Amino acid sequence: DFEEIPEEYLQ
Amino acid sequence: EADCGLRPLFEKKSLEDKTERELLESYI
Amino acid sequence: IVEGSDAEIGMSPWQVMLFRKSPQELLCGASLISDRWVLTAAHCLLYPPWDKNFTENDLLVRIGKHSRTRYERNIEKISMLEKIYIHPRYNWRENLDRDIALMKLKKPVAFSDYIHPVCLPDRETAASLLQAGYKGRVTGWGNLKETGQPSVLQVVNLPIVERPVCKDSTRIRITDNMFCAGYKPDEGKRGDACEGDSGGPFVMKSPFNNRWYQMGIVSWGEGCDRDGKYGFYTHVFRLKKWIQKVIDQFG
Ligand SMILES: *[C@@H]1O[C@H](CO)[C@@H](O)[C@H](O)[C@H]1NC(C)=O
Ligand SMILES: N=C(N)N1CCCCC1
Ligand code: NA
Ligand code: NA
Numbered sequence: 001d002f003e004e005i006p007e008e009y010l011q
Numbered sequence: 012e013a014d015c016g017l018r019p020l021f022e023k024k025s026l027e028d029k030t031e032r033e034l035l036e037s038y039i
Numbered sequence: 040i041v042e043g044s045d046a047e048i049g050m051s052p053w054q055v056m057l058f059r060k061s062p063q064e065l066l067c068g069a070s071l072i073s074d075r076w077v078l079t080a081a082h083c084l085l086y087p088p089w090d091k092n093f094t095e096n097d098l099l100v101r102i103g104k105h106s107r108t109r110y111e112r113n114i115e116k117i118s119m120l121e122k123i124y125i126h127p128r129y130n131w132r133e134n135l136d137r138d139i140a141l142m143k144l145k146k147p148v149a150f151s152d153y154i155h156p157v158c159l160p161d162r163e164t165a166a167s168l169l170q171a172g173y174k175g176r177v178t179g180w181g182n183l184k185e186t187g188q189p190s191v192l193q194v195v196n197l198p199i200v201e202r203p204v205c206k207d208s209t210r211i212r213i214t215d216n217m218f219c220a221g222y223k224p225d226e227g228k229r230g231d232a233c234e235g236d237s238g239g240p241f242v243m244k245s246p247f248n249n250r251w252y253q254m255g256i257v258s259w260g261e262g263c264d265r266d267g268k269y270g271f272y273t274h275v276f277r278l279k280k281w282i283q284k285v286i287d288q289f290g
Contacts, residue, residue: 001188002063003110009099009117010060012073016158016250019151020049028050030176031244033196037174038246 040179041264042230043195048105051178053157053253054192056101057083057238058117066093068179068239070253071102071156074147076286079238080256080273081129081140088131095120100142103153105191107180114153118144124285126278136214138258138273141285157242160252165276168243168254171201175220175243175254177270181235185263188235195230197221197241200269208269209261216277218255219269232270233263241272 021028055069055077067083077100084093103115121143130136148154160168174196183189197220205219213219220241222228232239241255255272262268275282 002065002108005058005063005099005101005110005117009119012156015072015156016245016252017155018049018052018251019153019155020047020052022249028047030044030194030196034174034176034244035246037172037198038168039172 040177040181040189040193040195040230040236041184041233043193046105046178046192046194049152050194051192052103052153052155053240054104054178055079056104056180058099058101060097060099065107065180065235066098067235067237068181068257069100069142070240071148071154072159072253073156074150075144075290077142077144078253078256078282079140079142080138080258081125082131082135082138082258083238084123084140085125085129086131093123095123100144102148103151107189107191116148116154118146118148121145122289124289126281134212134214135259137216137278139256139275139278139281141282143289157240157253158250159279159282160254160276162276164245164247164252165254167247168245168252169199169218169276172198173243174198175241177220177232177236177239177241177257179232179236179239179257181237182233182263185233185265197230197270205269205271208267213271216274217258217271218274219271220255221269224266229264231260231264232257
């Protein structure tokens with residue numbers, strides 16, 4: 001249900 | 012911090028939020 | 040939050056969302072206490088009865104938010120965790136005594152109109168304001184009812200309750216490291232924290248210096264917004280020596 005966050009914060 | 016607890020959009024501008032007065036009225 | 044309302048923009052700029060990386064989901068609330076430190080409940084991070092034991096790399100903190108589910112481009116800031124510190128005497132076995140934890144961010148967060156720290160109480164502000172009947176404010180993105188979920192941050196103001204009434208409401212052993220808040224059945228008004236609000240702040244605005252102080256952390260309850268039940272909160276001032284020790288040693 002959450003909008004994807006920028007991939008930079010998951011690296 | 013020195014500036015803690017003072018909100019940019021409220022205390023720093025001398026604007027009150029819609030329900031903070033309810034808190035003040037309870038401090039009797 | 041049950042029986043609250045939508046927050047105003049910038050109303051709670053110390054609000055933090057604890058966000059699980061995978062699956063991407065809300066884990067808890069939290070609060071910003073400096074540019075590098077976030078305060079939350081220990082049970083948000085460590086609760087063995089539910090096989091919960093998060094490590095730093097499992098989580099993110101999202102600061103400056105208003106919408107629950109949106110990525111708030113140009114407004115929110117997302118930070119990684121350097122280290123979690125849980126109170127060494129946090130009692131997850133029995134009653135959540137000393138339900139407090141700190142998270143140090145990898146880099147300082149930039150303050151803005153939407154991002155700003157709350158104060159921690161001194162002894163005198165705590166003694167003056169932690170009185171039955173005095174109201175504080177609880178905020179979060181948790182559920183709207185015990186048995187659904189908000190579009191934006193919710194807020195509710197609730198009175199501190201007399202300690203014997205807190206004790207008499209539950210079979211759980213209450214300690215000096217806890218206080219309870221909420222309306223009594225005869226008071227008509229309602230409201231409580233609920234699932235997903237854990238770890239977020241209970242704040243009071245000092246009438247002496249017109250600053251907001253975090254007096255409590257959403258800790259536990261039995262259901263949400265039940266008549267004759269109250270929400271329980273970690274007593275921040277009582278645990279402040281530990282907070283200061285961690286920040287002094289590791290900050
Ligand atoms: C939680 O996780 C760490 C390891 O990441 C572990 O060493 C620690 O003992 C665990 N705590 C409990 C109560 O299981
Ligand atoms: N305040 C209540 N009711 N709580 C604490 C937040 C999770 C649900 C129980
Ligand atoms: Na009891
Ligand atoms: Na209740």
